[PDB]
Amino acid sequence: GCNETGMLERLPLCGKAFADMMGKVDVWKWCNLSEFIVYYESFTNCTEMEANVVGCYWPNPLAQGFITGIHRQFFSNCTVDRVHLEDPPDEVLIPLIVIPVVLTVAMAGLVVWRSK
Amino acid sequence: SIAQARKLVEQLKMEANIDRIKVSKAAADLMAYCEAHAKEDPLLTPVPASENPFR
Amino acid sequence: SELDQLRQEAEQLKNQIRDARKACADATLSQITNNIDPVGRIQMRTRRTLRGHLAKIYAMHWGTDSRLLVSASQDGKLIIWDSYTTNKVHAIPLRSSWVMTCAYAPSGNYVACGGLDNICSIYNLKTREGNVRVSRELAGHTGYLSCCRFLDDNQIVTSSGDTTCALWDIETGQQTTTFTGHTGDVMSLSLAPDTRLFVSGACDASAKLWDVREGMCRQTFTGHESDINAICFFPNGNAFATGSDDATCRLFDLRADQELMTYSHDNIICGITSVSFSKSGRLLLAGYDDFNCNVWDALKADRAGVLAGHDNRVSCLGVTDDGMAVATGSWDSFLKIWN
Amino acid sequence: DQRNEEKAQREANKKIEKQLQKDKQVYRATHRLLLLGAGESGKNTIVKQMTSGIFETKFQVDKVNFHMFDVGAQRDERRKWIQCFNDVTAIIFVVASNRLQAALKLFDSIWNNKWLRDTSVILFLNKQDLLAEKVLAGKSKIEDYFPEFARYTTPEDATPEPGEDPRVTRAKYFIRDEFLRISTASGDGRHYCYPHFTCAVDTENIRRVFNDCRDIIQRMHLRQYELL
Amino acid sequence: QVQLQESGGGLVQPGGSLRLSCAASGFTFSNYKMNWVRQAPGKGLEWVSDISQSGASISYTGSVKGRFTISRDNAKNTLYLQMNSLKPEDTAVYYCARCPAPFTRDCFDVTSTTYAYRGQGTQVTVSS
Amino acid sequence: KCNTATCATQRLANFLVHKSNNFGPILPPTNVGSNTY
Amino acid sequence: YVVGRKKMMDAQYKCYDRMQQLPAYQGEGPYCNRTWDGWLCWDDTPAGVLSYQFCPDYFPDFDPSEKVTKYCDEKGVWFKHPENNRTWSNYTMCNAFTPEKLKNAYVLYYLAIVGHSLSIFTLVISLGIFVFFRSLGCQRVTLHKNMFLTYILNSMIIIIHLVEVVPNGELVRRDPVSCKILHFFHQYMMACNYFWMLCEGIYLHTLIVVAVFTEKQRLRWYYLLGWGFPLVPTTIHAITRAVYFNDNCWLSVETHLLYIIHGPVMAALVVNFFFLLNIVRVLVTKMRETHEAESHMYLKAVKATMILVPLLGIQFVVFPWRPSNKMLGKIYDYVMHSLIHFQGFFVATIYCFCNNEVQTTVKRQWAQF
Ligand SMILES: CCCCCCCCCCCCCCCCC[C@H](O)OC[C@@H](COP(=O)([O-])OCC[N+](C)(C)C)O[C@@H](O)CCCCCCCCCCCCCCC
Ligand SMILES: CCCCCCCCCCCCCCCCCCCC(=O)O[C@H](COC(=O)CCCCCCCCCCCCCC)COP(=O)(O)OCCN
Ligand SMILES: CC(C)CCC[C@@H](C)[C@H]1CC[C@H]2[C@@H]3CC=C4C[C@@H](OC(=O)CCC(=O)O)CC[C@]4(C)[C@H]3CC[C@]12C
Ligand SMILES: CC(C)CCC[C@@H](C)[C@H]1CC[C@H]2[C@@H]3CC=C4C[C@@H](OC(=O)CCC(=O)O)CC[C@]4(C)[C@H]3CC[C@]12C
Ligand SMILES: CCCCCCCCCCCCCCCC(=O)O
Ligand SMILES: CCCCCCCCCCCCCCCC(=O)O
Ligand SMILES: CCCCCCCCCCCCCCCC(=O)O
Ligand SMILES: CCCCCCCCCCCCCCCC(=O)O
Ligand SMILES: CCCCCCCCCCCCCCCC(=O)O
Ligand SMILES: CCCCCCCCCCCCCCCC(=O)O
Ligand SMILES: CCCCCCCCCCCCCCCC(=O)O
Ligand SMILES: CCCCCCCCCCCCCCCC(=O)O
Ligand SMILES: *[C@@H]1O[C@H](CO)[C@@H](O)[C@H](O)[C@H]1NC(C)=O
Ligand SMILES: *[C@@H]1O[C@H](CO)[C@@H](O)[C@H](O)[C@H]1NC(C)=O
Ligand SMILES: *[C@@H]1O[C@H](CO)[C@@H](O)[C@H](O)[C@H]1NC(C)=O
Ligand SMILES: *[C@@H]1O[C@H](CO)[C@@H](O)[C@H](O)[C@H]1NC(C)=O
Ligand SMILES: *[C@@H]1O[C@H](CO)[C@@H](O)[C@H](O)[C@H]1NC(C)=O
């Protein structure tokens, strides 16, 4: 079966290991995920192996509460960056579509008028 | 009309009182003209490109 | 009834002429030209395509220099082409757009045209001002002008739908001599090489030989079954060929006063619109209603070639004086030079 | 020498084609018409209401130019000069409603002519008021000159004018069917006949030609696209 | 030489019968559509009836339909017009008129005053 | 996701760019059974 | 693999920040606590609700258009799979129909190559006839030359894109400037090919209905509308693409910026549909005036429509939306891709090969050629 207490003792071993690797990264780079996503991947991988060793399926609520504490410890004030691939708001997107559309029928009607 | 048929008879008499040669003699004259001028006919055989103004 | 006797006497004279022609028909033209070698396959090619006419072309005529030619189209324009470079030399707007014939003076100084307006218009090409203006309008015909041919700068012979032909004095604009033998619309005329005689073809299925200076009908030629649409003299002036709606071309001899050869084929069921001989007279070119031009052997009655370049009815054709090329006009508003 | 002469010919040629371009837009814009009919058919009255071998009449409808031609000093033999009008927009055939049989034979020759196979015919059944006076009188009956008229019935698709005797309607529509039987025999979808009951003093004759010509040009464009 | 010669006819009683014949020569009779025309005294030329090249297409004018019968013999090159129940209205000179062009459905100018492909005519008189 | 008919060619190209393994051999399916997330 | 794992870890960071920034669930009754199942992030869900989320793109066999479901029972507990009793999310629909969709996409891929190759072949021969035989020339044929050239240029860019860009994963991952230039010319020539269909629809409507008499028009406006105007939606889309959605080689279709080009394209083709209704209305009117049979009227009227649907692109407006159904979507794919890719071949066969004016010119001029 699953031993939650065994997992909870083993979790500080992956949390502290990730916290020390975050010492090589200064507080300036603590916001951009692209700098420390390689360590965040191994830290998440550690919680999966530790839970599996104690017979627990990952993700589990106790391991989620531990990752949230680590997330609140380092990435509290850091804000998520702007999505690189995202459409503009509808206040801008709609004029970008309706203006070329009405220009099409305007030119189409102008051709019928000014041809002959 | 009477005048129309009278002039028709008048024209036929002038056409009948003509001297006509044999067709064999007339046919030989038409052939003799073609043979004597076949060399001067550019349409019979294609002339060289250097002598055709429509090159 | 005296008219019935005139009807009786006419049949006696026509029977006398028929027997007089039969006595001279000892051997036919095919028997005389039976041993001569055929000309072979004549393969002419379209060397020039004259483009610019807006409507169907009705007539054309080569100049005596064998380089310049005038064309008449029903759009109301007379265009003088340089057949060598395809450049247009003159564009003459016509008062009446329904032109049916055009002529080129032998001196190259004047052109003529006419049609449904019943007027033969003479245009001066060598004015010192540099423009082309009508110099004389020959009126007096009661029918449409079908053909016109210059004798000189002051004389021109015309044919009209009023069943008559006329000799005109260009200086005075009056008819010098009127030829009133035909009973139907005279469609075409051809001048003798010495300009002393001319033959005409009319819608009465008969051709007539006329004396220019005397003004008399010397000989009447029959044999066609429908209206004669075209006529052309043999190069020696002793024969002529006719084209009719009966899909046949016929060769007539003046001294024999009868037909010598018939040019027809079972595959041809359309009328002939234009006829002309080659320089030597060995080839007889004829335009047809089936958009094609057939090259016939004048001596052997054999079809030697076919000119198939036009997209509509071939209305006119002509061979240069030096025999270098043949022009063809058609209702597709295009002229084509063939070599 | 050789360079100056050929270059002067090229500049003269480009000047001619420059004028021919202006002549092309004028020629292609006007619609040519041929007016045909007997001497007493009423065509001359339509001309004045809108010697020389052919007359010209130019009128303009909705800024569209028309050029109607009338045959003047020409003989009664038409088989030759009628070929010149193969490219006209339409042939206006005026018939005085046995002069009627002669017009039927002339219409059959025009409709079945090889060079006029693609030319539409605007049929003006003229003198409709004079026809009514003869039918209402009863002295000159049609069935003696057209035996099939006795067994002829008025088509239900007919549009009789308000206040007109049915005998006049059956008479004028029988004459129309005599011309329609010739047109519908060899139509082949190439040309069509536009019959009209017209009078010599009718002001609608101009509008009938303009509307019929618009239908002819429409059917030509539809045929080029192979839609009809 | 295109020749058309009318024969038959003459004076006949009202209601009688006559048979007109036209001998054709100088052309291929089988390739041309034939016509019958007549000219009454003090009247113009009037088309009477026609027949196609083979003889299938036959039409008459309204006044003679049911009384006249047209036929042709291509082997004999002869055109026929069987006139039955003759009335005094039929009194006219009857001509056989050939169409101008062969292999054509149209037939122009056969009623013109001066037509070349038309015979001299034969006199038909119907009187008591 | 442009679902118009004019976007048909674009949808086919975008699908084969990512979901075709660059026109290579077919890959084993991703396990989505009970022993997964 | 490495890129798919980076997207998974990126979404994991976004959830733990989202699970701490969302307000506490204050709704009545029991609810499911927010949780990260390993692939997708889930919010507070009330008891007895089947949640829905779009499928991610971590694996090549996953389909983003499909849905992922996670259920809570009447209590505040997430669903547990009966086999393992583990908190389990349903990702079956993510790759259930992917092997079949990929097999059908391969057929459509080669259907596009052959359809455009056959179009290029027939249209080049068709354009050569209109150029060589000047007798066929006119304003109608003149516009046909520009219409045929758009199909040839559009098919050439599509073939190049499907052969050098689509099956080249190294080129897409590299993301060079060259593949973005090719996409720009692809969108431009696609719009010109569609706008020229409107130009023919405008020209045919002007001849048949609005301006029958003139028959002579300045063709400058048709040239500007066909070739010049499509530059407006193409550059506007390219500018917004380089700013907002700058994906690799601009191959993505999830962005709504594509409607900057496809929107006006659909508007132009709808006008052609309205032009189609007027042309057939005039056609059946001419037939009613000729008193022809109803059966003969229906056959030619329908045949007139099917003749105009390749030239005007009516197949785009009558089937403008792909059905969400799997069976209807598959048939829609085979029907639409066949009509689209073979459109150039259909126009060349109908208007040039089957045109009697062109045929009679070929049979007559065959001797001289
Ligand atoms: C120049 C003009 C004349 C010639 C014009 C045509 C020129 C064609 C040139 C070649 C085009 C590309 C190749 C086309 C043939 C592909 C064969 C390949 O084996 O695919 C067969 C099959 C299944 O493919 P897959 O196994 O999924 O590939 C799996 C592929 N992987 C293994 C890589 C994943 O796909 C075909 O069935 C598609 C059939 C439909 C498209 C082709 C036929 C269209 C119509 C042809 C003409 C019909 C008649 C027209 C008469 C006018
Ligand atoms: C006058 C009559 C005749 C006219 C004839 C010509 C007609 C067409 C003319 C078109 C001319 C302009 C074409 C380009 C328009 C601008 C496109 C880029 C706009 C833009 O956002 O600029 C930058 C793009 O940066 C980037 O990273 C860009 C990435 C994409 C690059 C590839 C672009 C492909 C298309 C180019 C076409 C050029 C030829 C057109 C014919 C900065 O953007 P940012 O600040 O958001 O920062 C993004 C991260 N760096
Ligand atoms: C490289 C491709 C994908 C995009 C850019 C294409 C342009 C370099 C070319 C290709 C086709 C050309 C067109 C081909 C034909 C014409 C018709 C032409 O008008 C005519 O009547 C032609 C007269 C003649 O060719 O002599 C005016 C230019 C235009 C629009 C051309 C404009 C320039 C275009 C669009
Ligand atoms: C997508 C990129 C690569 C396109 C680049 C080319 C266009 C920006 C330009 C260059 C040449 C231009 C053409 C040059 C000349 C003409 C002819 C012009 O019409 C006339 O001069 C006469 C028309 C007539 O009366 O028939 C109409 C615009 C057009 C087609 C132009 C349309 C716009 C074109 C194709
Ligand atoms: C009509 C002219 C153009 C014809 C273009 C034919 C293109 C055929 C493409 C077949 C599939 C090619 C797949 C890639 C092959 C490779 O990269 O070697
Ligand atoms: C006619 C079809 C092909 C059209 C051209 C396709 C390729 C366009 C891009 C070529 C390479 C451009 C490289 C630009 C580099 C730079 O601007 O720095
Ligand atoms: C003159 C008529 C113009 C008609 C224009 C119709 C445009 C339809 C566009 C449909 C695709 C874009 C849909 C945007 C909204 C959505 O995503 O559902
Ligand atoms: C796969 C493409 C299918 C295209 C289907 C197009 C159907 C068009 C239908 C047009 C009907 C017009 C009816 C007009 C009736 C009238 O006004 O008389
Ligand atoms: C104007 C005629 C042509 C219209 C072409 C587009 C029709 C689209 C119809 C379905 C619109 C669906 C919009 C919501 C789509 C979604 O978010 O699932
Ligand atoms: C002016 C109207 C033109 C024709 C418009 C046709 C619109 C068709 C819309 C889709 C119908 C088929 C059902 C689609 C269902 C779905 O969206 O999944
Ligand atoms: C204009 C051409 C239209 C037809 C194009 C070819 C269509 C072939 C068949 C496509 C569907 C194939 C799968 C059918 C599956 C089923 O029976 O439900
Ligand atoms: C000559 C036809 C021209 C029009 C285009 C027709 C395209 C037909 C495509 C048929 C695809 C059939 C795919 C079957 C796939 C399968 O079920 O295995
Ligand atoms: C779980 O782990 C703890 C500490 O490792 C151990 O004391 C205990 O025996 C294990 N088993 C259970 C059922 O608690
Ligand atoms: C995660 O752990 C598994 C099992 O040890 C390993 O195979 C995988 O490479 C690890 N991923 C990383 C890079 O942390
Ligand atoms: C959900 O989270 C709250 C906040 O910590 C906690 O009190 C509650 O027990 C959680 N529910 C479950 C089912 O774990
Ligand atoms: C899952 O749990 C339920 C209740 O705890 C139990 O009845 C069932 O046997 C379990 N199934 C498995 C496969 O462990
Ligand atoms: C997952 O979803 C599919 C389709 O929606 C369904 O067939 C299957 O039963 C679901 N799995 C479970 C465990 O409910």
Contact F19 G60 (CB under 8 A): yes
Measured CA to CA in angstroms, residue D8 lies from D1, D3, D5, D15 at distances of 11, 9, 5, 11
Residue spans of alpha helices (H) in chain C: 2-24, 29-32
Cα E80 from Cα E98, distance rounded (Å) = 13
Distance G237 CA to ligand 6 centre (A): 19
Whether G107 lines ligand 12, by a CB cut-off of 6 Å, is yes
Cα G5 from Cα G9, distance rounded (Å) = 6
Asked if C275 and C286 count as a contact pair (C-beta separation under 8 A), the reply is: yes
Tally: H helices and E strands in chain C: 2, 28
Contact C245 E114 (CB under 8 A): no
CATH number of domain containing C284: 2.130.10.10
| Coil/strand/helix, residue D110 | helix
Asked if D192 and G291 count as a contact pair (C-beta separation under 8 A), the reply is: no
Tally: H helices and E strands in chain D: 6, 6
| Coil/strand/helix, residue G315 | helix
* Residue bearing the CA closest to ligand 8, atom 14: G281
Q: Judging by DSSP bridges, how do beta strands D120-126 and D193-197 pair with one another?
A: parallel
| Coil/strand/helix, residue E93 | strand
Helix (H) or strand (E) holding G343: helix G343-348
| Coil/strand/helix, residue D111 | helix
Q: Dihedral sign, CA of D43, D48, D49, D55? A: positive
Helix (H) or strand (E) holding A101: helix A95-114
C311 vs G contacts (CB less than 8 Å): 135, 361, 364
Measured CA to CA in angstroms, residue C338 lies from A40, C309, D12, E1 at distances of 89, 10, 25, 36
User: F25 touching G, CB under 8 A?
Assistant: no
| Coil/strand/helix, residue C198 | strand
CA E75 to the chain's CA centroid = 18
Cα D217 from Cα G130, distance rounded (Å) = 24
**Tokens representing E3?**
């020749």
Q: How many domains does chain C have?
A: 1
Q: Does any domain span residue D69?
A: yes
What's the one-letter identity of residue G125? I
D53 vs C contacts (CB less than 8 Å): 116-119, 143-144
Q: Up-side HSE of residue D80: CA atoms within 13 Å toward CB?
A: 32
Chains G and E touch, using 3 or more CB pairs below 8 Å: no
Cα G79 from Cα G76, distance rounded (Å) = 10
What's the one-letter identity of residue C266? D
Q: Does any domain span residue D50?
A: yes
User: G284 touching D, CB under 8 A?
Assistant: no
CA G333 to the chain's CA centroid = 10
| Coil/strand/helix, residue G15 | helix
Cα C143 from Cα F22, distance rounded (Å) = 85
- What is the signed CA dihedral for C140, C145, C146, C150, rounded to 10 degrees? 70
Q: What is the 3-state secondary structure (H, E, C) of G178-247?
A: HHHHHHHHHHHHHHHHHHHHHHHHHHHHHHHHHCCCCCCCCCHHHHHHHHHCCHHHHHHHHHHHHHCECC
Q: CB under 8 Å to G192, separation ≥6 — which residues? A: G150, G153, G154, G226, G227, G230
Q: CB under 8 Å to B45, separation ≥6 — which residues? A: none
Whether G361 lines ligand 2, by a CB cut-off of 6 Å, is no
Cα D197 from Cα B37, distance rounded (Å) = 66
Helix (H) or strand (E) holding C91: strand C88-93
Q: Judging by DSSP bridges, how do beta strands D90-96 and D120-126 pair with one another?
A: parallel
Cα C66 from Cα C324, distance rounded (Å) = 8
CA G104 to the chain's CA centroid = 17
Cα E71 from Cα E90, distance rounded (Å) = 19
Measured CA to CA in angstroms, residue G197 lies from C169, D119, G138, G261, G268 at distances of 64, 33, 18, 15, 8
Cα G9 from Cα A37, distance rounded (Å) = 7
End-to-end, the C-alpha distance of chain D in Å comes to 59
Which ligand sits closest to the CA of G235?
2
B3 vs C contacts (CB less than 8 Å): none
Cα E95 from Cα E87, distance rounded (Å) = 18
Asked if C303 and C41 count as a contact pair (C-beta separation under 8 A), the reply is: no
Which residues is C77 bridged to in the sheet?
A: C73, C93
**Tokens representing E124?**
């038909």
Measured CA to CA in angstroms, residue A99 lies from A92, D112, G270 at distances of 11, 58, 17
DSSP line for A38-95: HHHHHHHHHHHHHHHHTT--SS-HHHHHHHHHHHHHHSSSPPPPPPSB-PPPHHHHTH
What's the one-letter identity of residue G154? N
Q: Which chains share 3+ C-beta pairs under 8 angstroms with G?
A: A, C, D, F
Q: Judging by DSSP bridges, how do beta strands E18-25 and E78-83 pair with one another?
A: antiparallel
CATH number of domain containing G172: 1.20.1070.10
Cα G232 from Cα G236, distance rounded (Å) = 6
Q: Judging by DSSP bridges, how do beta strands C165-169 and C186-191 pair with one another?
A: unpaired
Give the closest residue to D29 by CA, choosing from D7, D2, D78, D62: D62
Cα G133 from Cα C285, distance rounded (Å) = 26
Give the closest residue to C189 by CA, choosing from C215, C207, C211: C207
> Residue G320 CA: which ligand 9 atom is closest?
5
Cα D70 from Cα D86, distance rounded (Å) = 15
| Coil/strand/helix, residue C282 | coil
Q: Up-side HSE of residue C311: CA atoms within 13 Å toward CB?
A: 18
Q: Which residue range is the domain that position D55 belongs to?
A: 31-224
A 10 A CB-CB count for A86 gives 10
Cα E86 from Cα C78, distance rounded (Å) = 58
Taking the CA of residue A23 and the nearest CA in chain G, the distance in Å comes to 19
G208 vs D contacts (CB less than 8 Å): 218, 221-222
Give the closest residue to D124 by CA, choosing from D206, D54, D32, D53: D206
Cα G323 from Cα G334, distance rounded (Å) = 13
Helix (H) or strand (E) holding G330: helix G326-341
Asked if A28 and A36 count as a contact pair (C-beta separation under 8 A), the reply is: no
Cis omega (within 30 of 0) for bond into E88: no
Mutation target to probe the B interface, by most B beta carbons within 10 A, among C42, C68, C217, C280 is: C280
Q: Up-side HSE of residue E54: CA atoms within 13 Å toward CB?
A: 2
Superfamily of domain E3-126: Immunoglobulins (2.60.40.10)
Give the closest residue to C147 by CA, choosing from C264, C243, C246: C243
A 10 A CB-CB count for C291 gives 18
Give the closest residue to C50 by CA, choosing from C334, C326, C338: C334
* Residue bearing the CA closest to ligand 11, atom 14: G331
Give the closest residue to C291 by CA, choosing from C327, C262, C331, C318: C331
Which residues is C295 bridged to in the sheet?
A: C285, C305
Cα G187 from Cα F10, distance rounded (Å) = 10
Give the closest residue to A30 by CA, choosing from A62, A72, A69, A74: A74
Asked if D140 and D134 count as a contact pair (C-beta separation under 8 A), the reply is: yes
Among G58, G79, G94, which residue terminates a domain? G94
**Tokens representing G79?**
């669903």
Cα A39 from Cα A44, distance rounded (Å) = 9
Contact E47 D102 (CB under 8 A): yes
* Residue bearing the CA closest to ligand 15, atom 10: G33
Q: Which residue range is the domain that position C195 belongs to?
A: 2-338
φ, ψ at E90 (rounded to 5°): -80, 0
Q: CB under 8 Å to F14, separation ≥6 — which residues? A: G251, G252, G253
Cα G369 from Cα G360, distance rounded (Å) = 14
* Structural Rg of chain C based on CA atoms: 20
CATH number of domain containing B48: 4.10.260.10
Helix (H) or strand (E) holding G262: helix G259-289
Cα C279 from Cα A50, distance rounded (Å) = 113
Give the closest residue to A106 by CA, choosing from G198, F2, G209, G280: G198
Contact B9 C33 (CB under 8 A): no
Q: Which residue range is the domain that position G42 belongs to?
A: 2-12+19-94
Taking the CA of residue A18 and the nearest CA in chain G, the distance in Å comes to 15
CATH number of domain containing D138: 3.40.50.300
Quick one: chain E helix, strand, coil %, rounded to 5?
5, 45, 50
User: E47 touching D, CB under 8 A?
Assistant: yes
Q: CB under 8 Å to G325, separation ≥6 — which residues? A: none
Which residues is C288 bridged to in the sheet?
A: C272
Taking the CA of residue G225 and the nearest CA in chain A, the distance in Å comes to 7
Measured CA to CA in angstroms, residue G191 lies from G158, G311, G344 at distances of 13, 15, 15
End-to-end, the C-alpha distance of chain G in Å comes to 62
Q: CB under 8 Å to G292, separation ≥6 — which residues? A: none
Measured CA to CA in angstroms, residue C43 lies from B44, C46, C147, C306, G214 at distances of 10, 10, 30, 7, 43
Quick one: chain G helix, strand, coil %, rounded to 5?
65, 5, 25
Whether A89 lines ligand 15, by a CB cut-off of 6 Å, is no
Q: CB under 8 Å to G189, separation ≥6 — which residues? A: G150, G153, G154, G157
Give the closest residue to D82 by CA, choosing from C179, G85, C185: C185
Interface of C with E in 150-189 (CB under 8 A): 163, 183-184
- What is the signed CA dihedral for G167, G169, G174, G177, rounded to 10 degrees? 20
Q: How many domains does chain D have?
A: 1
A 10 A CB-CB count for B3 gives 7
Which residues is E77 bridged to in the sheet?
A: none
Give the closest residue to D87 by CA, choosing from D20, D26, D34: D34
Burial class (CB in 10 A: 0-12, 13-18, 19+), G113: middle
Cα E64 from Cα E61, distance rounded (Å) = 6
| Residue position matching structure tokens 């295109």 | E2
Contact B37 C218 (CB under 8 A): no
- Count contacts between C and D (CB, < 8 Å): 91
Asked if G50 and G79 count as a contact pair (C-beta separation under 8 A), the reply is: no
| Coil/strand/helix, residue E2 | coil
Cα C254 from Cα C195, distance rounded (Å) = 15
DSSP state of C67: S
Asked if F32 and G181 count as a contact pair (C-beta separation under 8 A), the reply is: no
**Tokens representing B5?**
């048929």
CA C108 to the chain's CA centroid = 19
CA D92 to the chain's CA centroid = 2
**Experimental technique behind these coordinates:** cryo-EM
Asked if G72 and F33 count as a contact pair (C-beta separation under 8 A), the reply is: no
A 10 A CB-CB count for G107 gives 12
Cα B35 from Cα B37, distance rounded (Å) = 5
What's the one-letter identity of residue G327? M
The sheet with strand D90-96 has its strands ordered as: D54-61, D64-71, D31-37, D90-96, D120-126, D193-197
Give the closest residue to G248 by CA, choosing from G345, G323, G182, G197: G182
Burial class (CB in 10 A: 0-12, 13-18, 19+), G356: exposed
CA C333 to the chain's CA centroid = 20
Asked if G91 and G83 count as a contact pair (C-beta separation under 8 A), the reply is: no
Cα D46 from Cα D126, distance rounded (Å) = 10
Q: How many domains does chain B have?
A: 1
Q: CB under 8 Å to G243, separation ≥6 — which residues? A: none
Whether G331 lines ligand 2, by a CB cut-off of 6 Å, is no
Contact F4 G262 (CB under 8 A): yes
Chains G and C touch, using 3 or more CB pairs below 8 Å: yes
Among G77, G94, G111, which residue terminates a domain? G94
The sheet with strand C88-93 has its strands ordered as: C57-62, C68-73, C77-82, C88-93
Cα C115 from Cα C143, distance rounded (Å) = 9
Q: Dihedral sign, CA of D109, D115, D119, D124? A: negative
Asked if C246 and C225 count as a contact pair (C-beta separation under 8 A), the reply is: yes
Distance G114 CA to ligand 1 centre (A): 6
Cα C45 from Cα G24, distance rounded (Å) = 95
Q: What is the 3-state secondary structure (H, E, C) of chain F?
A: CCCEHHHHHHHHHHHHHHCCHHHCCCCCCCCCCCCCC
How does G253-270 read in b/e, with b if 16+ C-beta sit within 10 Å? Answer: bebbbbbbbbbbbbbbbb
Contact C184 E114 (CB under 8 A): yes
Whether G328 lines ligand 11, by a CB cut-off of 6 Å, is no
Measured CA to CA in angstroms, residue F25 lies from E42, F15, F22, F32, G108 at distances of 104, 16, 9, 21, 18
**Tokens representing G208?**
């048949």
Give the closest residue to G352 by CA, choosing from G117, G135, G122: G122
> Residue G339 CA: which ligand 8 atom is closest?
1
Asked if G278 and G205 count as a contact pair (C-beta separation under 8 A), the reply is: yes
Contact G368 C291 (CB under 8 A): no
φ, ψ at D65 (rounded to 5°): -85, 135
DSSP state of E88: G
